[PDB]
Amino acid sequence: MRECISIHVGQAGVQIGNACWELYCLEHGIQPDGQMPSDKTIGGGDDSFNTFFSETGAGKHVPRAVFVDLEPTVIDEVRTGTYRQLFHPEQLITGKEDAANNYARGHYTIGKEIIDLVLDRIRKLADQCTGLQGFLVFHSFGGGTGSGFTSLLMERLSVDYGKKSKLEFSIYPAPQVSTAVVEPYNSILTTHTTLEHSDCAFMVDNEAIYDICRRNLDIERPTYTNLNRLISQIVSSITASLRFDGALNVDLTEFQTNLVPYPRIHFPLATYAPVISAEKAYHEQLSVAEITNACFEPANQMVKCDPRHGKYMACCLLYRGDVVPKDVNAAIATIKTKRSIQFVDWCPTGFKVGINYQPPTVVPGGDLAKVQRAVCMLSNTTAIAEAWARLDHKFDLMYAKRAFVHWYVGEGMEEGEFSEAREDMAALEKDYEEVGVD
Amino acid sequence: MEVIELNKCTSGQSFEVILKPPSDPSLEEIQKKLEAAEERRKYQEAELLKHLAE
Amino acid sequence: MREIVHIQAGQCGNQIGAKFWEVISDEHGIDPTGSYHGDSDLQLERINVYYNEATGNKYVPRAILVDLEPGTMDSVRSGPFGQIFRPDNFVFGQSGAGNNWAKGHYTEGAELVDSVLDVVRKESESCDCLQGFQLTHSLGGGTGSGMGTLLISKIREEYPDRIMNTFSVMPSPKVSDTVVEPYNATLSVHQLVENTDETYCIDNEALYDICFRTLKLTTPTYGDLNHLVSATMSGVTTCLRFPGQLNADLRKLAVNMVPFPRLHFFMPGFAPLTSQYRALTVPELTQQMFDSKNMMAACDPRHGRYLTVAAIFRGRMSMKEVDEQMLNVQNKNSSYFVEWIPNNVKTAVCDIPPRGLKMSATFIGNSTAIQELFKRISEQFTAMFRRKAFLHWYTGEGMDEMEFTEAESNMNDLVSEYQQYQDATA
Amino acid sequence: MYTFVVRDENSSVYAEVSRLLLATGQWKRLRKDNPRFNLMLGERNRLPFGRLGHEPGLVQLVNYYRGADKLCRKASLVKLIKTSPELSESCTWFPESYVIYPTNLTDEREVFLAAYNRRREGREGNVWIAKSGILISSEASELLDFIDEQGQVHVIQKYLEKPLLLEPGHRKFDIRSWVLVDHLYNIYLYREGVLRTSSEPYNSANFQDKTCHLTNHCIQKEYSKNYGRYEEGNEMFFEEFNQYLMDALNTTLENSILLQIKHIIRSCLMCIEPAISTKHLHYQSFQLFGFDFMVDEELKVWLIEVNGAPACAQKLYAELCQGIVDVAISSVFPLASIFIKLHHHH
Ligand SMILES: Nc1nc2c(ncn2[C@@H]2O[C@H](COP(=O)(O)OP(=O)(O)OP(=O)(O)O)[C@@H](O)[C@H]2O)c(=O)[nH]1
Ligand SMILES: Nc1ncnc2c1ncn2[C@@H]1O[C@H](COP(=O)(O)OP(=O)(O)CP(=O)(O)O)[C@@H](O)[C@H]1O
Ligand SMILES: Nc1nc2c(ncn2[C@@H]2O[C@H](COP(=O)(O)OP(=O)(O)O)[C@@H](O)[C@H]2O)c(=O)[nH]1
Ligand SMILES: Oc1cccc(CN2CCSCC2)c1
Ligand SMILES: Oc1cccc(CN2CCSCC2)c1
Ligand SMILES: [Ca+2]
Ligand SMILES: [Ca+2]
Ligand SMILES: [Ca+2]
Ligand SMILES: [Mg+2]
Ligand SMILES: [Mg+2]
Ligand SMILES: [Mg+2]
């Protein structure tokens, strides 16, 4: 058994982390007080779920998580919420005032003063791990903390834990659920300095989660709670292999090995299905073929783009529920005959498949309907470059007038970092086109 | 349409299906970066207080 | 715990400040004796942003009342909620400022500024984490204008990294007390361009026109104009005083509303403005709020372009319908929104409507149309200054002509900076 | 009130559509860089499809289908027809073609020679045409040397040595059909087509003078010496062409040719529908196409190419451009039939 430490940075990371650990507990039969009746080894054990939970002598199963935010109002919800008992206070770190959506402020001004503390707390978790695999870092692109402090943390992690994998769950900025105007700046600044430090990053576009919540769940105006429960379903699908007995994606290094041929191109596309409204009278349970075909519909993608006009480098199907290999290969064969799935000429046209028999768990009273089988497809497509183009274009419009630049310079950043970061994104866009276009 | 590496356990199974074969900055350097930015913030503040003292 | 220290200076500053505390004290359930008698936890959620808590569950506004003559602050102390203010936070002189910027900024005001800062320091020393400061004042008089901007300058020196916010009443010959108002305003705008982070421009002419033409007030009074200011101030601070999926502290507002440091002057708008029991649908709120006749800057937004817009809707209404209406206003008047700041129109919703209203909408715009307000001032200023009219009131206080020339050049530069981005394209 | 941007100032077609849109008093044109638009009249090259359909509250529509180039590229079309099971290499309406890359750079060089030798040995007509600057030759040695002297990809296809010649004049011609595909992927055929006729007598014993073989409107009005003799501007419309078919062949344009044209259009467009459809997409596409056909002396219709940015016949701009606004734009942005629907299974 090898441990995984989750790091939640900023409001989005923290609130998503809260929704994931709530789900993890329901999935492993852990009560809010930390007790786990099914766990027969008290105060220890090297089971699969122990990759994410430690154990006290009193039988409490404590998440291997660190929550960090430069302002206390969001983490104070964890300190007094339903699961206030799961984490001990040392795991919840909060500053006094946030980065005001200013990358430079979270990276330079405020990050400089709290970085060593966060490292100390993380070192306390590492010392409890007999074989630490790596870190899972949750954060937004647009926030001043999620962008600025994360990139600083990722730099230090590569120093203190050189031989450790680092995975990201990054929230891509969407205007429909954001009141910030400078997020294109923060997104490009954080991607530039974090790129060489991240081994695999799963971008979730809030625009996609918002549309799925309006379209499938019939929520006229979804909230962050609605968005976070759906997001945690996908995170759970992606991390289930580390927490349950299995043979696919068993350690963090496998995500890079199966999904990232080239280090810079480490942004796989995530697709999840089915999302069914719980308020629905009663849905007709979808089949393996139907949910598998849905993985190739843009409407179920975590980032809206057209994979038909990119090229695939790898493709992973992660099923949960009543699924047998027979139905998967049969549905796959049919999809190849109907879909535009073009792989690069230097990669095998194949799919890695994982099945976990335990069906998706849903939070009681939540928006998601209980389904008998679900699937999350992780594919590395050049089509996800569309997201970099969109973002880079918004960056160009504001930077051509130097709009808002003074806020970053005022915090100690040099204007040259904008152009250096932008030129790195221009090169990243070029790499995606060198692989996908003819 | 081939299957390989079929693994089975009590909580699920995993396999591979092939359809067609193919054809850092050191700790010191980070300190300099941070402290350099802190210095430029000190310079700008100094010019404000200098401006205000005048 | 993101506390704000409020300062109100001069006659206009204290009259508008008093009504503002009267309005929000009602919204938060605070009575005139500091006792909370509300019915919702949302009222006490962010109560510490503007109110200090004393013994006996009393809530005392974190407000400093400043003036160079006692007259106005005596009216406040004897007004509706006069008892609510901390007795130690009344800082006043006797000489007065004679509607003279130089007296408030240099002579009479310097003699009193240190004790105001002593009270400011006392309030800041007790804040868990100070957001910043907000000042209410006029620009056409002497105390709020001249001493007001002096206080800002000294607050900058002692708290250089805190946000400095002002509600600034711009003079107008139509609602004028003295002919020297353009002098006092031009000198203040110079201080504001350099030392404030966000200034909400409140034009007394717009306040007058709205009372006369829209509200149908035959003979408006200063009290009538201040009702609009109270309402507007309550609106622009809604997302600081109540919980919501917005958070928003002063610095995060500035970061997203100010693309360039000099251009931090905002035009506020409010709706409804009815002369009354009728229910106002969301489209009615959005059409009215964005209409010129609903704006306090006496500037026609169609004469310029919005750099950024922030709007708040208060009341129980269709949050989906709100997005549909805001998105409809931009996508149907795209010529008046700059296209090189993606998604520069942002909207927030709050469930608590203002007193006596099912719902309302307040909005602030960083529009290049504001340049017309500064052009008007600059015109009146130069008309008098070219003949050196009334200057002896100022040179008699130690000021030199060169200081007027500098303030004029800087304000005229500001106009050119607005005109530069009004023509900018992608 | 709808808004649109123009990003191809050289499109005669959508210039008229732009001039019509503004005429309805219900459409507002923005700067080409303003992203808050409902309709994009996009650029021919490198159209940024990746930025469409991400504006909150804006339903956005574009006049190009992402991926239609697979059809409107000489080499792409040859590969599509040979590798698509819906079309197969046995497709009976597309001349035998081969993709040939210049030697200074897969490639079908040898495969082309195998078929050529078969024709030379069997006494059969063995003339081919190369294009990407066009060359017609009956000797294989010449066609290949022409592609190597260039630097871009070329295709070599069989030259129709038995074209249908109009009389009097004994002259060649081609048929242009305009086809509009809307966001629902309905395939509409403009009821009006044009024949671009050769003003010179067809001479099968000399491919050196390419004025009686190339019926392009540009090659006829510049190098031909009988321009505008038989028909104004070397353009004959269906009404006249149909009456000619009745007088000479005792047949009709519909039976003799138009059925085949409709079949070819459906076959090509249905083939790529899974790849380019915007049905389940965050933005919507439509596009006007120009299909170029050849008719042989057996009244068999051959597909020559498909133009993705076609112009129109001057006499037909008004009606067609109004038809684009009616079915393509107003269908998505309603305000306050000249087409033939080629029904199919979506
Ligand atoms: N999906 C999702 N997105 C969120 C959530 N909270 C914030 N965001 C997004 O994150 C972006 C804003 O960044 P934040 O995470 O709120 O800022 P931060 O990381 O706390 O850093 P600060 O600027 O210091 O507050 C916007 O695009 C929001 O839409 C959340 O709970 N779920
Ligand atoms: N295989 C073939 N047999 C007979 N004629 C042919 C032919 N291929 C091309 N042509 C002649 O060439 C002309 C069309 O050329 P082509 O369309 O390939 O060039 P082009 O694309 O630059 C002109 P456009 O796109 O405007 O139709 C037709 O008029 C036709 O007469
Ligand atoms: N809206 C409003 N404007 C005022 C009020 N009192 C004064 N003014 C305006 O403010 C200017 C006079 O400044 P004043 O505040 O009286 O001077 P001070 O007391 O020395 O600061 C003139 O432009 C007046 O029209 C008021 O109560 N409300
Ligand atoms: O004119 C100025 C030059 C520098 C700084 C400032 C103060 N402030 C303006 C709002 S943005 C944050 C900075 C004004
Ligand atoms: O930055 C923001 C974006 C949307 C809304 C708000 C809240 N508020 C600010 C004062 S004016 C009314 C609107 C802030
Ligand atoms: Ca155990
Ligand atoms: Ca590393
Ligand atoms: Ca004195
Ligand atoms: Mg935050
Ligand atoms: Mg007065
Ligand atoms: Mg062509």
Side-chain angles (χ1 to χ4, degrees), chain A, chain B, chain C residues 1-245 248-426, chain D:
Chain A
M1 184 277 302
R2 308 192 68 199
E3 300 82 1
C4 292
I5 295 183
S6 289
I7 305 180
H8 311 273
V9 182
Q11 176 179 136
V14 164
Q15 288 190 149
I16 292 180
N18 210 33
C20 292
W21 290 100
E22 178 192 41
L23 185 52
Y24 294 161
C25 291
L26 298 179
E27 290 188 1
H28 299 292
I30 299 180
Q31 303 163 6
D33 61 333
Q35 296 298 309
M36 181 179 180
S38 58
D39 181 5
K40 302 306 175 183
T41 43
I42 310 303
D46 55 355
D47 288 319
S48 291
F49 66 94
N50 285 113
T51 68
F52 279 54
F53 298 78
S54 57
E55 301 179 35
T56 69
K60 179 187 295 185
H61 298 64
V62 184
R64 305 182 191 273
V66 175
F67 289 58
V68 182
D69 200 357
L70 303 173
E71 161 238 4
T73 65
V74 185
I75 283 181
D76 284 339
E77 301 286 3
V78 174
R79 295 188 172 112
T80 55
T82 302
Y83 294 90
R84 61 188 182 274
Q85 302 180 82
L86 286 186
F87 325 86
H88 47 237
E90 295 87 18
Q91 307 168 240
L92 307 181
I93 314 175
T94 60
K96 289 279 177 176
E97 64 186 351
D98 59 37
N101 289 345
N102 189 337
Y103 172 97
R105 186 164 173 85
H107 185 94
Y108 297 92
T109 307
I110 299 183
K112 173 180 187 298
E113 312 294 339
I114 202 180
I115 181 69
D116 291 329
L117 172 65
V118 174
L119 292 189
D120 179 78
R121 299 288 170 80
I122 297 174
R123 177 61 56 180
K124 284 178 175 177
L125 293 178
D127 295 11
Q128 268 198 128
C129 304
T130 63
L132 177 60
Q133 307 181 29
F135 304 87
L136 306 181
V137 191
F138 302 79
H139 66 101
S140 60
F141 272 180
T145 299
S147 69
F149 180 77
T150 299
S151 65
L152 176 63
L153 181 62
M154 296 284 290
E155 286 185 325
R156 290 292 294 269
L157 288 183
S158 299
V159 176
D160 287 351
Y161 312 80
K163 310 303 189 63
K164 263 74 172 64
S165 289
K166 297 194 285 284
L167 273 62
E168 304 186 73
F169 291 94
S170 297
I171 303 308
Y172 179 106
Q176 269 169 306
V177 301
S178 170
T179 47
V181 179
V182 296
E183 288 176 279
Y185 283 170
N186 298 338
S187 305
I188 284 180
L189 294 173
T190 191
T191 301
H192 172 57
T193 66
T194 304
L195 199 64
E196 274 301 69
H197 299 279
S198 184
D199 295 292
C200 185
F202 302 97
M203 290 190 303
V204 177
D205 188 339
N206 266 348
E207 173 185 89
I209 313 303
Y210 186 79
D211 282 315
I212 295 173
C213 288
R214 293 205 295 179
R215 186 194 319 112
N216 303 28
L217 302 181
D218 292 325
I219 305 303
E220 303 203 27
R221 214 300 181 176
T223 68
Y224 279 143
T225 299
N226 304 130
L227 303 177
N228 292 340
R229 288 202 168 107
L230 180 56
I231 292 175
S232 67
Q233 286 298 333
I234 287 78
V235 178
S236 175
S237 293
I238 296 178
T239 76
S241 55
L242 312 162
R243 301 177 288 114
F244 294 96
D245 194 359
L248 179 67
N249 291 339
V250 65
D251 64 67
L252 300 171
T253 311
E254 212 165 344
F255 286 93
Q256 183 279 336
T257 288
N258 291 340
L259 298 168
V260 188
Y262 286 82
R264 288 169 61 86
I265 314 296
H266 60 245
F267 298 93
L269 178 61
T271 313
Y272 188 83
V275 181
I276 305 292
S277 172
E279 296 294 343
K280 214 172 188 301
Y282 227 83
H283 194 68
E284 342 78 50
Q285 281 306 263
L286 302 181
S287 66
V288 175
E290 291 177 331
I291 76 181
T292 298
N293 184 12
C295 286
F296 297 87
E297 287 300 348
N300 307 290
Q301 299 170 355
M302 301 310 111
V303 185
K304 284 183 183 184
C305 56
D306 200 338
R308 297 178 297 171
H309 298 109
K311 281 198 172 195
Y312 289 90
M313 291 163 281
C315 200
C316 256
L317 293 174
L318 306 174
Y319 297 86
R320 299 183 76 177
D322 189 46
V323 178
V324 302
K326 173 174 54 182
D327 293 4
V328 182
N329 300 325
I332 282 183
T334 298
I335 296 181
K336 268 306 301 179
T337 60
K338 289 185 173 60
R339 297 287 185 169
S340 301
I341 303 174
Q342 262 286 319
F343 282 71
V344 299
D345 297 312
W346 50 272
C347 287
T349 301
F351 305 90
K352 279 189 185 59
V353 184
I355 299 176
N356 189 285
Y357 296 156
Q358 183 162 295
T361 304
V362 295
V363 180
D367 301 312
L368 294 195
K370 176 62 179 178
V371 300
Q372 273 309 298
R373 64 187 60 92
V375 65
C376 173
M377 191 177 72
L378 306 184
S379 56
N380 197 334
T381 308
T382 64
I384 206 174
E386 299 180 24
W388 298 125
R390 290 160 49 207
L391 211 54
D392 287 331
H393 184 73
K394 291 180 174 186
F395 181 102
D396 289 348
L397 286 168
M398 298 195 300
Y399 195 76
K401 316 290 185 304
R402 299 305 188 270
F404 301 102
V405 172
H406 70 278
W407 282 106
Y408 300 70
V409 177
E411 294 293 346
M413 205 176 83
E414 311 183 274
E415 208 182 47
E417 183 166 351
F418 277 95
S419 64
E420 187 187 70
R422 179 56 177 93
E423 296 176 12
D424 193 4
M425 302 300 303
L428 186 66
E429 274 185 276
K430 181 177 180 176
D431 298 336
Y432 274 102
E433 199 176 27
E434 299 183 15
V435 183
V437 186
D438 304 358
Chain B
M1 189 64 177
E2 183 185 19
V3 173
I4 67 180
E5 299 175 354
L6 172 64
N7 297 91
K8 298 173 59 190
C9 79
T10 304
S11 51
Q13 63 181 290
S14 58
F15 61 93
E16 190 176 20
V17 52
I18 294 182
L19 310 175
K20 181 203 300 184
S23 300
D24 289 334
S26 59
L27 178 63
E28 152 210 17
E29 296 163 332
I30 296 175
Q31 275 300 303
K32 296 168 188 173
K33 181 185 68 173
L34 295 178
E35 294 182 354
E38 178 177 43
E39 218 57 15
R40 285 182 299 270
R41 278 192 318 269
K42 288 182 182 175
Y43 179 92
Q44 297 183 61
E45 169 166 320
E47 296 310 328
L48 184 59
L49 298 186
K50 184 207 305 291
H51 178 75
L52 293 172
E54 294 180 1
Chain C
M1 313 172 189
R2 38 190 61 162
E3 295 82 27
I4 298 179
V5 177
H6 168 94
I7 307 176
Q8 49 187 73
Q11 178 173 21
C12 180
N14 277 277
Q15 293 178 174
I16 289 178
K19 302 300 299 185
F20 165 75
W21 286 106
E22 177 176 0
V23 167
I24 70 166
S25 295
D26 174 69
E27 292 187 2
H28 290 278
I30 312 299
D31 64 4
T33 57
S35 300
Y36 170 80
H37 285 275
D39 68 328
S40 179
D41 307 326
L42 295 66
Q43 292 176 292
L44 299 173
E45 186 77 12
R46 320 252 294 182
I47 194 71
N48 60 48
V49 176
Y50 282 95
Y51 295 85
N52 273 312
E53 189 173 4
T55 308
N57 200 26
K58 297 284 186 173
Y59 292 107
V60 182
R62 193 175 301 98
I64 309 180
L65 297 72
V66 184
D67 201 347
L68 282 168
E69 63 193 359
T72 300
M73 286 168 52
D74 283 358
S75 300
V76 169
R77 202 179 310 123
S78 296
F81 290 73
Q83 308 286 11
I84 204 188
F85 294 105
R86 202 177 188 272
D88 304 312
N89 291 23
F90 288 84
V91 192
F92 53 82
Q94 296 298 339
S95 65
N99 292 290
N100 185 318
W101 189 89
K103 287 185 169 186
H105 197 87
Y106 287 123
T107 53
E108 309 295 331
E111 186 169 10
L112 181 75
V113 71
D114 281 349
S115 58
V116 177
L117 298 177
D118 292 338
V119 184
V120 175
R121 189 170 312 98
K122 182 277 168 189
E123 287 294 353
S124 300
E125 293 183 359
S126 60
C127 293
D128 165 68
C129 189
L130 177 69
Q131 274 199 39
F133 309 82
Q134 85 179 28
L135 171 72
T136 61
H137 65 150
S138 69
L139 304 188
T143 305
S145 190
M147 186 179 187
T149 53
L150 183 70
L151 281 180
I152 288 173
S153 193
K154 295 198 178 308
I155 292 172
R156 253 301 133 78
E157 193 175 23
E158 184 166 346
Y159 309 84
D161 81 329
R162 300 295 86 181
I163 288 294
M164 177 66 66
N165 202 14
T166 75
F167 296 86
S168 296
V169 173
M170 319 292 164
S172 167
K174 313 304 176 49
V175 190
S176 171
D177 291 351
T178 65
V179 299
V180 296
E181 287 167 358
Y183 284 164
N184 299 324
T186 299
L187 293 161
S188 291
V189 166
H190 183 36
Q191 301 296 319
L192 296 175
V193 178
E194 305 294 347
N195 294 318
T196 67
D197 307 299
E198 300 169 287
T199 290
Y200 307 102
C201 302
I202 302 175
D203 192 325
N204 259 0
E205 178 162 359
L207 297 183
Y208 185 89
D209 287 330
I210 293 171
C211 287
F212 190 98
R213 306 182 192 183
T214 310
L215 298 178
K216 299 310 179 189
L217 304 186
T218 304
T219 314
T221 69
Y222 275 134
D224 296 328
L225 279 56
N226 299 339
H227 169 70
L228 296 176
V229 188
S230 289
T232 293
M233 295 188 65
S234 171
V236 307
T237 69
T238 295
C239 280
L240 303 167
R241 300 186 282 101
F242 294 103
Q245 207 184 83
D249 54 83
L250 290 184
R251 182 181 282 105
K252 194 173 290 185
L253 173 65
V255 157
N256 289 287
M257 290 297 291
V258 180
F260 311 93
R262 304 266 305 270
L263 311 186
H264 59 269
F265 297 88
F266 303 151
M267 310 189 320
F270 186 89
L273 299 174
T274 302
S275 55
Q276 49 180 149
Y277 313 107
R278 172 188 173 183
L280 210 67
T281 76
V282 177
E284 294 181 330
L285 270 187
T286 317
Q287 293 182 278
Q288 295 190 207
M289 181 184 59
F290 278 106
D291 183 5
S292 69
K293 302 191 297 298
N294 284 70
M295 297 201 186
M296 275 76 185
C299 289
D300 194 351
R302 305 177 77 93
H303 293 176
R305 310 187 65 172
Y306 283 117
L307 296 174
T308 56
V309 176
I312 196 282
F313 288 74
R314 305 180 62 174
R316 303 179 67 232
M317 76 202 62
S318 175
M319 193 172 305
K320 163 185 173 60
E321 195 176 40
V322 176
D323 293 324
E324 296 187 349
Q325 290 305 332
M326 293 302 297
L327 295 179
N328 180 273
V329 176
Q330 336 172 19
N331 306 326
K332 294 183 72 70
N333 314 283
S334 60
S335 46
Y336 307 106
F337 294 90
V338 303
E339 78 286 8
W340 42 273
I341 303 182
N343 308 117
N344 52 341
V345 184
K346 294 303 178 181
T347 299
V349 171
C350 176
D351 311 322
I352 295 178
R355 176 59 90 105
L357 284 181
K358 276 295 182 68
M359 57 194 59
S360 64
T362 301
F363 102 96
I364 64 176
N366 187 341
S367 162
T368 73
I370 192 70
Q371 77 165 279
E372 283 179 325
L373 184 166
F374 298 115
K375 286 183 183 178
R376 290 187 297 260
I377 302 294
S378 186
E379 266 180 324
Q380 306 159 15
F381 173 99
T382 313
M384 299 181 303
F385 191 64
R386 72 196 176 192
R387 308 284 295 264
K388 297 188 175 179
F390 303 96
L391 261 180
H392 74 105
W393 295 122
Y394 298 80
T395 57
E397 299 302 320
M399 289 188 62
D400 190 86
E401 298 183 2
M402 197 61 63
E403 184 162 349
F404 285 72
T405 297
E406 297 172 3
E408 174 182 39
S409 295
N410 191 221
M411 188 171 69
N412 283 340
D413 289 329
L414 189 67
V415 165
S416 291
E417 272 138 64
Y418 281 119
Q419 185 62 31
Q420 174 183 356
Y421 297 111
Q422 181 170 306
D423 302 332
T425 64
Chain D
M1 186 65 61
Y2 306 104
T3 69
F4 73 100
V5 306
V6 170
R7 296 168 64 90
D8 186 1
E9 309 289 326
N10 304 320
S11 172
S12 50
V13 173
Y14 293 96
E16 176 66 358
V17 174
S18 171
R19 196 278 299 180
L20 289 179
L21 295 176
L22 294 165
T24 64
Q26 311 180 30
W27 282 84
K28 182 167 174 295
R29 179 177 173 175
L30 320 174
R31 307 199 200 98
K32 63 209 309 175
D33 300 313
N34 192 329
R36 281 201 178 281
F37 59 86
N38 291 119
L39 172 66
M40 164 179 294
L41 308 185
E43 56 263 64
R44 300 184 190 86
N45 296 123
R46 309 200 63 91
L47 205 172
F49 299 95
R51 305 204 312 257
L52 303 171
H54 302 271
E55 282 293 346
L58 276 189
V59 178
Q60 293 184 323
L61 170 66
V62 56
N63 65 338
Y64 278 102
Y65 263 95
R66 190 186 188 188
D69 60 302
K70 265 60 179 184
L71 213 57
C72 315
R73 248 63 186 184
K74 305 290 205 305
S76 300
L77 180 59
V78 172
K79 192 172 184 171
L80 174 67
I81 292 180
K82 291 186 171 182
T83 60
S84 303
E86 303 81 2
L87 311 179
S88 69
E89 191 180 23
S90 58
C91 157
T92 70
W93 41 257
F94 186 72
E96 184 185 4
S97 299
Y98 300 92
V99 179
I100 301 296
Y101 294 87
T103 66
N104 51 276
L105 280 57
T106 48
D107 182 69
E108 295 181 330
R109 266 183 178 269
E110 292 189 1
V111 184
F112 164 83
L113 302 185
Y116 177 88
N117 291 321
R118 176 179 295 171
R119 283 188 172 274
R120 164 177 296 191
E121 182 188 13
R123 293 303 98 100
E124 285 193 357
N126 200 8
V127 177
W128 304 77
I129 179 179
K131 47 191 176 182
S132 66
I134 286 71
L135 171 52
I136 310 178
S137 179
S138 60
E139 304 300 348
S141 63
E142 306 172 2
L143 293 184
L144 291 182
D145 288 341
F146 177 76
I147 297 180
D148 301 335
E149 296 165 323
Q150 300 295 358
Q152 69 285 12
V153 185
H154 276 65
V155 299
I156 302 178
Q157 72 175 184
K158 186 67 186 62
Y159 187 94
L160 298 172
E161 304 177 31
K162 304 176 172 182
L164 180 69
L165 297 185
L166 310 178
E167 303 289 346
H170 199 70
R171 46 206 185 86
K172 197 172 189 172
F173 75 90
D174 77 304
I175 295 179
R176 158 64 65 85
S177 295
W178 293 277
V179 174
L180 181 55
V181 185
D182 67 7
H183 58 305
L184 305 181
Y185 215 88
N186 293 321
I187 303 174
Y188 297 108
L189 173 61
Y190 183 24
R191 71 158 90 105
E192 288 291 355
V194 302
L195 283 66
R196 295 178 288 177
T197 68
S198 176
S199 44
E200 296 294 341
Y202 180 81
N203 181 94
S204 59
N206 181 17
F207 308 95
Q208 184 180 1
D209 181 359
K210 305 175 299 179
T211 304
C212 83
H213 300 285
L214 292 62
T215 63
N216 296 319
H217 184 289
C218 70
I219 310 177
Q220 296 293 336
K221 189 180 180 183
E222 266 295 1
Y223 304 104
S224 182
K225 302 182 179 185
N226 285 325
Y227 183 85
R229 182 185 190 179
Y230 305 84
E231 43 273 334
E232 187 169 2
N234 290 14
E235 299 183 348
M236 175 189 299
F237 297 92
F238 279 3
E239 187 174 8
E240 182 178 0
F241 183 53
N242 175 67
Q243 187 70 217
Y244 169 88
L245 289 180
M246 293 186 296
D247 300 334
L249 295 319
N250 189 12
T251 192
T252 70
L253 170 57
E254 171 68 37
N255 292 20
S256 64
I257 294 172
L258 206 59
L259 272 188
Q260 299 178 79
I261 295 186
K262 282 182 282 204
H263 173 72
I264 300 172
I265 302 176
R266 295 182 54 199
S267 295
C268 296
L269 285 168
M270 291 182 61
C271 179
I272 62 184
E273 177 177 3
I276 68 174
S277 172
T278 62
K279 180 180 181 184
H280 302 319
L281 210 56
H282 37 287
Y283 70 90
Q284 298 301 302
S285 289
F286 70 94
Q287 188 172 357
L288 180 59
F289 289 94
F291 282 73
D292 293 0
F293 297 94
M294 278 286 299
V295 188
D296 69 9
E297 53 187 14
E298 295 284 284
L299 291 180
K300 177 186 169 179
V301 169
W302 297 87
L303 174 62
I304 296 306
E305 72 160 2
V306 183
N307 296 271
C312 190
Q314 166 70 347
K315 195 195 71 172
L316 303 179
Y317 265 109
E319 199 187 30
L320 177 55
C321 284
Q322 174 61 40
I324 301 179
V325 179
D326 288 0
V327 313
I329 304 181
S330 292
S331 60
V332 177
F333 308 99
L335 305 179
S337 180
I338 80 175
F339 295 101
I340 308 168
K341 185 179 181 184
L342 313 182
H343 289 83
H344 65 289
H345 299 183
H346 310 268

